[PDB]
């Protein structure tokens with residue numbers, strides 16, 4: 436190794452889900468072990484981190500994707516040779532939860548048929564924020580709870596349900612550990 440540093444098998448994880456569920460922030464927060472305080476992009480640059488699985492090392496490549504409608508056309512460009520997807524919804528946006536079964540799961544079933552994926556509930560620090568709960572209880576909506584995520588993950592055939600907050604980093608480690616296990620599960 437005079438020409439280059441440590442190297443390793445590269446794996447590819449792509450993140451999909453609704454506008455404003457926290458995909459980008461989930462990725463920047465995992466990568467930098469801090470919530471992005473400065474300027475947050477629509478889409479985070481391709482980025483990888485080293486992990487140590489079962490005494491073997493791997494580079495987990497992290498691909499972000501926009502969930503709006505300007506970025507519809509070009510999104511499936513990210514999908515080829517993916518090893519695992521994360522389908523994110525925000526536990527304080529029920530509408531994104533209903534878009535799992537009805538928008539993100541069909542898209543994956545059409546383009547990466549036999550690629551495993553997880554179901555990730557995001558922004559769980561808002562689940563009991565006074566300001567948020569009340570904005571929600573204006574529409575007699577309430578936050579998605581843990582039991583609803585687990586149930587939904589089974590129906591759709593996700594490998595599991597994991598929750599996190601990008602803000603405090605709770606659950607983040609588990610999200611990506613489980614993405615790896617789901618891949619390295621021969």
Ligand SMILES: Nc1nc2c(ncn2[C@@H]2O[C@H](COP(=O)(O)OP(=O)(O)NP(=O)(O)O)[C@@H](O)[C@H]2O)c(=O)[nH]1
Nearest residue numbers: 454455456457458459460477501502558600601602
């Ligand atoms: N409190 C809290 N806010 C969060 C969290 N994650 C993201 N946010 C906030 O949620 C908003 C959108 O975040 P973002 O990561 O851009 O979501 P996105 O899914 O990437 N959006 P897009 O599809 O358009 O790229 C921002 O105001 C951001 O600060 C979280 O875990 N907790």
Ligand SMILES: [Mg+2]
Nearest residue numbers: 458459477478
């Ligand atoms: Mg994004």
